[PDB]
Amino acid sequence: EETLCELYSHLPSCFFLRKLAKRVQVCLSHVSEEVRHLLGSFTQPLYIASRYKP
Amino acid sequence: FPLIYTGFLTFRRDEDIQRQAERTEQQKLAMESELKPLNCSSRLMSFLKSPQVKFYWNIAS
């Protein structure tokens, strides 16, 4: 999981990065909440903290 | 007339002030991890000079 957490730490600036910056006011759950808001309220959350292994 | 002073249509001065404060906050947040203030009374006297208003008063006359 650590590699994916670190790989989210190097985004160049975009509108997604500004929304992620608004939400941190990086563990993966902060990604998933923003993704859930983008995709729709009906679908279920993509990632879960400390269960990235199956 | 007083619904303008209450605020039902947006204004350029407050939108620019909010946008400048938002840009400043964005720059501060990126660091972490000029524009006039708005008048209160002359709001109305500044509203009664735009041409979109005078066209409607002239067509009423």
Side-chain angles (χ1 to χ4, degrees), chain A residues 18 21 24:
Chain A
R18 286 198 290 268
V24 295

PDB file of all heavy atoms in Angstrom, chain A residues 18 21 24, chain B residues 26 29 33, unseen atoms left out:
ATOM      1  N   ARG A  18      -6.583  20.708  -6.199  1.00  0.00           N
ATOM      2  CA  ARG A  18      -7.176  21.735  -5.350  1.00  0.00           C
ATOM      3  C   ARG A  18      -8.326  21.176  -4.528  1.00  0.00           C
ATOM      4  O   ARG A  18      -8.484  21.539  -3.357  1.00  0.00           O
ATOM      5  CB  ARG A  18      -7.637  22.927  -6.186  1.00  0.00           C
ATOM      6  CG  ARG A  18      -6.496  23.781  -6.685  1.00  0.00           C
ATOM      7  CD  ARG A  18      -6.970  25.157  -7.122  1.00  0.00           C
ATOM      8  NE  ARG A  18      -7.762  25.166  -8.346  1.00  0.00           N
ATOM      9  CZ  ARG A  18      -7.246  25.342  -9.559  1.00  0.00           C
ATOM     10  NH1 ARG A  18      -5.940  25.516  -9.708  1.00  0.00           N
ATOM     11  NH2 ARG A  18      -8.034  25.348 -10.624  1.00  0.00           N
ATOM     12  N   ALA A  21      -6.810  19.245  -1.779  1.00  0.00           N
ATOM     13  CA  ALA A  21      -6.287  20.182  -0.797  1.00  0.00           C
ATOM     14  C   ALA A  21      -7.392  20.745   0.077  1.00  0.00           C
ATOM     15  O   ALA A  21      -7.178  21.001   1.264  1.00  0.00           O
ATOM     16  CB  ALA A  21      -5.550  21.315  -1.506  1.00  0.00           C
ATOM     17  N   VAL A  24      -8.147  17.938   2.633  1.00  0.00           N
ATOM     18  CA  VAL A  24      -7.225  17.630   3.721  1.00  0.00           C
ATOM     19  C   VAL A  24      -7.241  18.685   4.818  1.00  0.00           C
ATOM     20  O   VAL A  24      -6.601  18.488   5.861  1.00  0.00           O
ATOM     21  CB  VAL A  24      -5.788  17.422   3.227  1.00  0.00           C
ATOM     22  CG1 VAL A  24      -5.718  16.202   2.339  1.00  0.00           C
ATOM     23  CG2 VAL A  24      -5.308  18.638   2.497  1.00  0.00           C
TER      24      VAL A  24
ATOM     25  N   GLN B  26      -5.650  29.687  -1.625  1.00  0.00           N
ATOM     26  CA  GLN B  26      -5.056  28.607  -2.407  1.00  0.00           C
ATOM     27  C   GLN B  26      -3.537  28.680  -2.378  1.00  0.00           C
ATOM     28  O   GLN B  26      -2.858  27.654  -2.239  1.00  0.00           O
ATOM     29  CB  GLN B  26      -5.570  28.655  -3.845  1.00  0.00           C
ATOM     30  N   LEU B  29      -2.402  27.585   1.065  1.00  0.00           N
ATOM     31  CA  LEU B  29      -2.515  26.142   1.239  1.00  0.00           C
ATOM     32  C   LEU B  29      -1.426  25.404   0.472  1.00  0.00           C
ATOM     33  O   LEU B  29      -0.909  24.385   0.946  1.00  0.00           O
ATOM     34  CB  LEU B  29      -3.897  25.667   0.800  1.00  0.00           C
ATOM     35  N   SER B  33       1.257  22.865   2.697  1.00  0.00           N
ATOM     36  CA  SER B  33       1.343  21.407   2.624  1.00  0.00           C
ATOM     37  C   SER B  33       1.555  20.904   1.198  1.00  0.00           C
ATOM     38  O   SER B  33       2.007  19.774   0.985  1.00  0.00           O
ATOM     39  CB  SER B  33       0.081  20.772   3.216  1.00  0.00           C
TER      40      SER B  33
END
